[PDB]
Amino acid sequence: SLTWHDVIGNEKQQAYFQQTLQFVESQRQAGKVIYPPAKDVFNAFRFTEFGDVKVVILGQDPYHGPNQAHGLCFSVLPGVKTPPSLVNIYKELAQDIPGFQIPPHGYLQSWAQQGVLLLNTVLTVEQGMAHSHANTGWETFTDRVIDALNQHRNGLIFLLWGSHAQKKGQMIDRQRHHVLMAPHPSPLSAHRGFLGCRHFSKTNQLLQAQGIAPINWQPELES
């Protein structure tokens, strides 16, 4: 029943956090193209409340091209070309989940509505520049996010894809929470151990073992 407000609202008063927001705003004011739009930065928290989190998936940076990032890792809004990482996520789901169909869009917010926290560890990026906002304080913030989930929840499933995400989750209590590892679904590593990981069926097995409803991984468009 605890909310993000309850467990991490205190971050608003932290110097590092205020300095992160001040930096992003100054960059925007200077004419830097920063993604996602300001109104979307915290969408993962909007769409999966703290007490509602069942599954945590980490990304690193928001997508850095136009029309892509909207505040959820890996997702793009309807009408946008499915980026390479999500192409591979979808390929895995098609093999892993009976009856899953690769959708003609990349919008994953229906996963968030079911309790899948779609968290990037860095929450903004300058256009075309990977890792541009890596050392701005966002990693501090998302460290606090992961610590809150680790300490104040039990039985979460963390899907940690790639070395950055796995290092990010190094403090997660692996007895109290269920951590699943695979490489990043980017084409740079998908074919070297992500494809075949079966994380989506495994996640559902673990949820069912707890008496929790499994995720319907088939993404839905707005109605």
Question: Active-site positions?
Answer: 61
Q: What is the dihedral of CA 189, 190, 193, 198, to 10 degrees?
A: 150
Residues 206 and 198 sit within 8 Å (Cβ to Cβ): no
In the bound state with Cl ion, the residue whose beta carbon lies nearer, of 54 and 168, is 168
120, 114, 116, 46: which is closest to 85 by C-alpha? 120
Count of chain residues binding Cl ion (CB under 5 A): 3
User: Minimal distance in Å, beta carbon 84 to Cl ion?
Assistant: 4
Cα separation values, 11 from 20, 52, 145, Å: 11, 20, 10
User: Minimal distance in Å, beta carbon 160 to Cl ion?
Assistant: 17
55, 53, 77: which is closest to 66 by C-alpha? 77
Segment lying near Cl ion (by CB under 5 A), choices 14-22, 80-88, 153-161, 211-219 = 80-88
Positions in 121-140 near Cl ion (CB under 5 A) = none
In the bound state with Cl ion, the residue whose beta carbon lies nearer, of 38 and 130, is 130
189 touches Cl ion by CB under 5 A: no
Query: Can you read off the two tokens belonging to residue 143?
Result: 């460290």
88 touches Cl ion by CB under 5 A: no
What are the φ and ψ backbone dihedral angles of 116, each rounded to 5 degrees?
-95, 110
Residues 140 and 11 sit within 8 Å (Cβ to Cβ): no
- Report DSSP state, residue 213: P
Segment lying near Cl ion (by CB under 5 A), choices 16-24, 75-83, 124-132, 138-146 = 75-83
157-161 and 55-59 beta bridge pairing: parallel
Near Cl ion by CB under 5 A: residue from 20, 48, 75, 85:
85
Segment lying near Cl ion (by CB under 5 A), choices 24-32, 83-91, 105-113, 147-155 = 83-91
Near Cl ion by CB under 5 A: residue from 83, 115, 137, 219:
83
120 touches Cl ion by CB under 5 A: no
84 touches Cl ion by CB under 5 A: yes
Which residues sit at the interface with Cl ion, rule CB under 5 A?
Answer: 83-85
